[PDB]
C-alpha cells in the first residue's frame, strides 16, 4: 500500500495541531466526529445532519505508548486526546458505507452516527473537501480530506 494511513493528522510539514483534551463516555474509533457535553466529557456527536454551528472536532489517534493506532478503539472513561481542525489542513476522516468519491473537491457533510458522507451543500454544514479518489463500501474507512 503506497498510501499508508497510520496517522490521523497528515496536514503539512509545518502546521501543528490544536488539541482538546477531555473525558470519554464510550469507545469510539479514531477519525470520527465528536461533540463535547456537560461536565468535561467527550463522546460521539449524535446530532442531526442538518444542524449548523458544530465545531470540527475529530478523534486523534492515541499515543503509541498507550496502545493507540488508527484502528484501535479508545478505552472508556479515560482521557481522550482529540483534534480541533483549523481551516486549511488535511485530516483523515471516516466515511459511511455505499458512496464513491469521484472528483477531488466535493463537499463533506456529517452523518448522524459520527461518520461523514457526501451530502448536498444546501441543507447541511460543510466541514471539509475530498482529496482522494477512492470508493468505499465498509463503514469505517479512512479517506483524506482538506478541512477548508
Amino acid at each position: 500500500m503506497a498510501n499508508s494511513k497510520n496517522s490521523i493528522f497528515v496536514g503539512g510539514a509545518g502546521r501543528v495541531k490544536q488539541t482538546i483534551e477531555g473525558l470519554a463516555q464510550s469507545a469510539f474509533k479514531p477519525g470520527q466526529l465528536l461533540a463535547r457535553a456537560a461536565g468535561d466529557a467527550i463522546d460521539v456527536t449524535a446530532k442531526a445532519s442538518t444542524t449548523y454551528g458544530n465545531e470540527f472536532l475529530i478523534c486523534d489517534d492515541q499515543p503509541q505508548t498507550l496502545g493507540g493506532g488508527t484502528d484501535v478503539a479508545v478505552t472508556a472513561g479515560d482521557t481522550v486526546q482529540a483534534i480541533s481542525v483549523l481551516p486549511g489542513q488535511y485530516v483523515l476522516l471516516s466515511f459511511a458505507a455505499t458512496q464513491n468519491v469521484t472528483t477531488k473537491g466535493a463537499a463533506v457533510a456529517s452523518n448522524g452516527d459520527g461518520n461523514f458522507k457526501l451530502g448536498n451543500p444546501a441543507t447541511e454544514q460543510t466541514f471539509a473537501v475530498t482529496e482522494e479518489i477512492i470508493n468505499v463500501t465498509t463503514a469505517g474507512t479512512l479517506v483524506l480530506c482538506r478541512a477548508i
Partner: protein
C-alpha cells in the same frame, strides 16, 4: 518634563503589589526540596513494596528439619502531569515603557510564577478527576483513598488547653496503633486554629502562656508544627514526609523561555512550564501513612 495643567500633582510609580498569605507554601516547599528527579515522558511511576516472611523451629539438641519461606511483592502507582503558564504584552506599549524605565515585564515573571504554583498547590489538596492513565488518579490530600480519614469531635478553635492534647493524641494514634507506622512525624494546621492557639491556658498559672507553647513541649515527637492556608477552619493534617511517606517526584524542573519574534510587530511572549506528581505511601499489608483531620 510635565505640562502646566499637571503641576499640581507629584507622582511616584514605584509600585507595590499584594502580599500572598500566611503560611502559604510550607508543605510544598518541603516536598519539592526532597523530590526525586525522573525523566520526562514517564507518565506512571511504579514503586515496589515487599513483605515479611519466616518460619522458626526450635529444639534442645539442634538436629531438626529447618523450614523455609520467602517474600512476595506488590506495586503502587502514581502519575506525572504537566503544568504551564504564559504572559505577554503588545509592541507599541513595551517600546513606550522601555523609555520610562517602568519595568512591567520582570514584574510579571515574578507574578505568574506565583500563580503557577497556586494550581499545583490546588492540585495537591484537590486532585482533579481528569488526569488518569490506568488507575493512577490522585484525588487530593483530603479526598483520597490513600489518606486515613479521622473525624474530630471537639472544635479546636474554641476548646481549652486540656481538650487540645486529649484530641491531638487521638489523631496521632491512627498512625502508631491502627496503622503501625513509626518515625518522625509532621503536623499542619489551618490558620483559623493557629491563631486561636494563642488564648489563655487555664491550667498553667505562673504568668500567661498560650496553647501553642503547650504543644511544643508536651508532644516532642513532632518535627515541625506549621500553618498552611489550604486548610480552612477546623481541620488539621498529620503525616510522615520523606521517601517512606508523603513524597513527590519531579518530571521537569521549572524552566522558562521566550517565543522568538519574527516580524517587527510581533508581540512579546514568555512561557513557564513545570511537571511533577504526588503520592502517599502504602505498605504491602495495606497500612496507610497520612491522616487528614476532619
Amino acid at each position: 518634563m510635565q505640562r502646566v495643567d499637571e503641576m499640581y500633582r507629584l507622582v511616584d510609580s514605584t509600585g507595590t503589589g499584594e502580599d500572598r498569605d500566611w503560611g502559604n507554601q510550607t508543605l510544598l516547599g518541603r516536598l519539592l526540596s526532597q523530590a526525586q528527579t525522573v525523566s520526562i515522558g514517564k507518565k506512571v511511576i511504579e514503586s515496589r513494596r515487599y513483605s515479611e516472611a519466616g518460619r522458626i523451629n526450635r529444639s534442645m539438641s539442634g538436629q531438626t528439619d529447618i523450614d523455609m519461606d520467602k517474600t512476595k511483592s506488590s506495586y503502587q502507582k502514581m502519575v506525572i502531569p504537566v503544568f504551564d503558564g504564559a504572559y505577554g504584552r503588545d509592541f507599541r506599549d513595551y517600546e513606550a515603557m522601555r523609555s520610562e524605565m517602568l519595568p512591567a515585564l520582570a514584574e510579571d515573571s515574578e507574578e505568574i510564577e506565583f500563580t503557577l504554583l497556586d494550581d499545583v498547590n490546588d492540585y495537591l489538596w484537590n486532585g482533579d478527576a481528569k488526569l488518569k492513565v490506568d488507575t493512577a488518579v490522585w484525588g487530593g490530600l483530603k479526598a483520597d483513598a490513600s489518606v486515613a480519614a479521622y473525624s474530630l469531635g471537639a472544635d479546636l478553635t474554641t476548646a481549652t488547653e486540656a481538650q487540645v492534647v486529649a484530641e491531638l493524641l487521638a489523631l496521632l494514634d491512627v498512625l502508631r496503633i491502627t496503622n503501625k507506622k513509626s518515625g518522625p512525624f509532621e503536623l499542619y494546621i489551618s490558620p483559623q486554629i493557629m491563631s486561636n492557639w494563642q488564648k489563655l491556658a487555664g491550667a498553667n498559672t505562673n504568668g500567661f502562656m498560650n496553647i501553642m507553647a503547650a504543644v511544643r513541649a508536651l508532644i516532642p515527637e513532632f518535627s515541625v508544627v506549621e500553618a498552611d492556608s489550604a486548610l480552612q477552619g477546623n481541620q488539621v493534617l498529620c503525616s510522615v514526609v520523606g521517601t517512606r511517606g508523603l513524597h513527590a517526584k519531579i518530571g521537569m524542573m521549572m524552566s522558562s523561555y521566550q517565543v522568538p519574534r519574527v516580524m517587527h510587530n510581533d508581540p512579546y511572549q514568555f512561557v513557564k512550564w513545570f511537571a511533577a506528581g504526588f503520592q502517599s505511601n502504602n505498605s504491602f499489608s495495606g497500612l496507610k501513612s497520612t491522616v487528614y483531620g476532619s
